[PDB]
Symmetry: D2
Subunit: 378 residues, 4 copies
């Protein structure tokens, strides 16, 4: 009955009969006495854990959904979902998804799984990719990175379900604060909670959030058997960062808008990429599906080698991951997109001077000034 | 350089050669080997710990100050500062300061320290209480709880420093987001970091932030000898919550204002105390000395017994403590100020029907709606 | 510096500058590149110094060049299984751990061939390793809950003549009692959740091995599957490890005490414990195990199993094993209530079989609890 | 009930719902009162179930009705001392811990008299309680660094003749070895930082005692001065506690081996150890506790102590003690350093006196490190 953001603080809190703890106590026990228990359902830590369940309930609540399942990492959430794709079945996706994600395509490719890449930023190449024989899953990551292009979740989901296939959105980029894939018509939202949700760069995690109860059983059976389960202490940490998730996200957003305007005024900056610009080729889709433009910005550096620019920052940290409280900068060409080749990256239209910013919660004008000195050099 | 809303993130965050950790590691070791450093400075966890030291630089950094020292609790921070008042010396304070402080004041009185309570809102009552012989320490807590009256730190410090007295401000209530005691002319800011600084209701800590190097030495020697140090994991949790202190406080303040409006609108609400109201009894001081007027609210409930009001809240948690992520309601006559003396209450202000809100970060409209329908009960 | 010293200083990977004796806990998911010279710390799923110290410690215990830890024992097993391709054979035992068999099932449902075998006789082992396309031989020894014991050296020699990797699930024994690599295996598999962490407060897995190309494949899978343990999780396992040898020998010594009172009891029939003389594989236990472990099983003759379980006041009724708190369970109700009663009678698992997991409590108190509980 | 079951289960809970064997970690500072029947929990500094669990466990180790834990040993000590009123005297062991003398100087500053005594002779124990208004008799045993011992029962006999309070700082022996309350003292003081927690990764203190009015005052003090430990820290101490007995048993057995090694080295003079016949209270040693401990001191004869300290390659060069990692220190140069030159030698402390704190590493490993060190 209550509202998001109240959900962030109390959503799947708990209550704690016995003592009245407001913050639920941390359940580290691997084992349980089955005689105390007036109705046995906590057996063993890999299967059942109170702290882990609270995090799950919280996450499910953020999306008005019946089920969530958390994992040791974002990659483990993806690996679990992908595991359900059978040989002689087909995962429609895109040549531009996350590199770890593409690795789970690689591994899947050897279990009779056909990976059909095609384009989903248009209607046109949606229908063909969808008419693929034996197609089981459609895999959308939106916005994409580092190009910050998007995919119309509702329309892709309309055309996919027409074929009784499953649609997952990797929603890590935007967080549930900004984008609600299940609301848009997707069947699953996938998160690396390592980013935004936990939000302090001090714990690894993944989550799936969904409604299908058949899917719920297959997912929990896999997690229990594969054992890709997170620790209780790490569920505590992810749960902790959640309270401030929307406060952090909109601080991150506001600063992003600032830096984009700083960027658009630099003589040594070419293209600036940001889902919320009026020039963005899919501005109608961003406005239709995202509540705000996000914490990530990309741009073409013109003032010389990216490698030299990277060092000049004296506030942004250079490094990988995103969404953390500390602002980060990277050159995908040198870092995140290193494993792809240039003509690859070039097909992608990822130049070697593409710079990516992940915006933290520091003072906006502090971040703007570090960016400007860095660009200016000297 | 760096503004406050950046120092929260990067204060106390020197890197770490070899590995490059963005978040510094948690130093749990109580124990050190000589030969691993090049001169001897880490001998033992009680005296020295990098994680504790990192939190300290951050806290000091929030007030543009040389030193900070953190503690096992706000009470411990208070006990430490108080320990530096010798037998025969007089502490001037108020009869409405936090009890934990006064309980501590009682402890001092039995060692030969004498204690004097004082209204610190009037030129005379300030100028008189600051004529207390052998004055050594002026203990200012502003806003005072639960009534949210306010004391002019600059003025009171512009007269204590004439008597040869050190001034502390328990700045727990406002946090260094909203009030800057050292800038206002005080010598020490005291914090329970247990409240808004840690801010997630999952760790205790205190802090003292100051400038006097002579004081720094005395403060560390006591913490070392008394042993009231926080643990590493706890310093980590305090340090972690502090990242979002600015974002949290401003949300908390934004909602407090909404609740204050809801309160003012209600026919079963009498007095409303809030430092931001055009008729707060110290609006000019609040105007000049804080940047926003805080996220605690108090009010007289007219609709029946206070207990019955408390049960009717479905989102507000009933508990003592304040400033954490979860909104809390209490009745000082039943929760905090409870054990008092029913004749005395009327002097200090604390009424039967007095209710105190500590505003969190849930949706302002959710909290407002919970409040409005506790106020409507009558069974 | 020897083996009890391995537990304390194993990988106690230094603290340049501050001098910390206990290494600080590295929780950062990420790393400033610039902050290291030749940057090789990038992202926590791939790199983490706390995890590395634990792995280095664990490998140290078997004098192995490598180790990799995991979010759970299941994850360790799943990683090793992932290297077997469809059509290839994994040879093992019907009475392997139910988590493992689920993983066999997953793999079987991918086309990998899982072949179960008797692995305790000469005939039975040739009738195992003869399968064509044999890439993996999976030994759990001792096997739980009947405490049978497979000859690791002999099975390893035979498996290797067809080029098959041999893994030993050494969770039951721990590396203080049994060393699979020294015995001939290629991989030691662990649920550190059990006796290794020792305190029943953290789930973890590990693999310990000696081949560098195996190493690369294991790390590539862990990075991609993302079945990595947490920083704080690793700290708890590491901290547990320090006392592993002390705890293990306390548990074994108490196990031996409990075995005699059991065999003395008129409401107890058969008793299982690898260290008894009449154990059909008694030569093998001697040769390959420095002590016979701290797991005990027995046939209970004196009333329904559920009532026996209800009479303990020191032992706890639950699962996992190897921890400091002693546990009891009844396989037919708890490890295998979900079995065909049919497949129960022939696994040698009676409806009244009781398993003890011995902790570190006073042996007198545990013996008293057991005795009054047996109510003989 | 015997002395190792209480380490595991003392203060350990069911979870009237979930059944957690290891009780969950209560990090909350605040408590939704509205539920709790007749209210127990109001605020963290005053109440916390995790903290209480540790207290029940510690009290159980000496079957005392009460225990209170603190941020540190100093804090436990500071609390006990605050109860002494201005103008009263504390009789104490003159080679007490400096931190205690630091607190002693606080009470020296805060009105109290600090008066040490030879606590080892009748012809001076009596003339120590001769002090007017004797509040506290403060014993630490064995002492540092010469390991002299004080007869707890005898000193208590005459201290109680005056109606005073007797505390024993019992950190050194731990409750595994020595039981001050059983011996006749009123309070046991611990630095749980040392062998109790046991792994050098948490600070802590404890008081264990039996009188309800001391209990009220101790708790009133802790709540007010706020020297409270965190919930996670209490978790670490409690977790380390499980193995305290196994660890102490181990450290003692190794200490004895080291003592034999030392006695045979031509560069060793006097050796101090509570378990040698030559120790002047070796008789009292035998009386008042079960195994002579994990601390050993000796005069190095090869010149400056730094010569020796620098040669160890397993022993860690630094302070604290009782932990899993063996430590070596030099008191004249570290713990006992800053005492000048016209002093120190009354505490019998020479400039090549060496103190070992024995961890759990392999004994022949520790024995070998000490050998090369001694024989550069
Ligand atoms: Cl929208
Ligand atoms: Cl008094
Ligand atoms: Cl001053
Ligand atoms: Cl191999
Ligand atoms: Cl089960
Ligand atoms: Cl007493
Ligand atoms: Cl004895």
């Amino acid at each position: 009955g209550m509202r998001f953001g109240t959900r962030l603080v109390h959503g799947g809190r708990r209550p704690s009969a016995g003592t009245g703890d407001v913050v639920p106590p941390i359940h580290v026990s691997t084992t349980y006495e089955r005689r105390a228990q007036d109705e046995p359902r906590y057996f063993y830590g890999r299967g059942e854990n109170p702290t882990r369940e609270e995090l799950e309930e919280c996450l499910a609540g953020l999306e008005r959904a019946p089920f969530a399942t958390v994992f040791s990492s974002g990659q483990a959430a993806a690996a679990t979902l992908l595991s359900l794709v059978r040989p002689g079945q087909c995962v429609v996706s895109t040549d531009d998804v996350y590199a770890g994600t593409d690795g789970l395509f690689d591994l899947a490719a050897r279990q009779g799984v056909r990976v059909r890449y095609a384009d989903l930023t248009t209607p046109e190449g949606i229908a063909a990719a969808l008419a693929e024989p034996d197609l089981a899953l459609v895999w959308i990551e939106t916005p994409t990175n580092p190009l910050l292009t998007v995919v119309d979740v509702a329309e892709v989901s309309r055309r996919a379900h027409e074929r009784g296939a499953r649609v997952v959105v990797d929603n890590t980029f935007a967080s549930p604060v900004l984008q609600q894939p299940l609301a848009l018509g997707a069947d699953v939202s996938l998160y690396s909670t390592t980013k935004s949700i936990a939000g302090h760069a001090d714990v690894l995690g993944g989550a799936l959030v969904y409604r299908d109860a058949d899917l719920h059983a297959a997912v929990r059976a896999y997690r229990t058997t594969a054992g890709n389960v997170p620790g209780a202490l790490d569920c505590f940490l992810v749960r902790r960062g959640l309270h401030t998730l929307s406060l952090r996200v909109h601080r991150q957003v506001a600063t992003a808008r600032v830096l984009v305007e700083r960027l658009r005024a630099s003589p040594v900056v070419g293209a600036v990429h940001y889902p919320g610009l009026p020039e963005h080729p899919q501005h109608a889709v961003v406005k239709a599906q995202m509540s705000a433009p996000g914490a990530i910005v990309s741009f073409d550096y013109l003032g010389g080698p990216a490698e030299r620019l990277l060092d000049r920052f004296t506030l942004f940290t250079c490094g990988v991951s995103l969404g953390g409280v500390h602002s980060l900068v990277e050159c995908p060409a040198l870092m995140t997109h290193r494993p792809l080749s240039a003509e690859a990256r070039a097909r992608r239209g990822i130049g070697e001077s593409l710079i990516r910013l992940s915006v933290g919660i520091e003072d906006p004008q502090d971040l703007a000034e570090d960016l400007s000195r860095a660009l200016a050099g000297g």
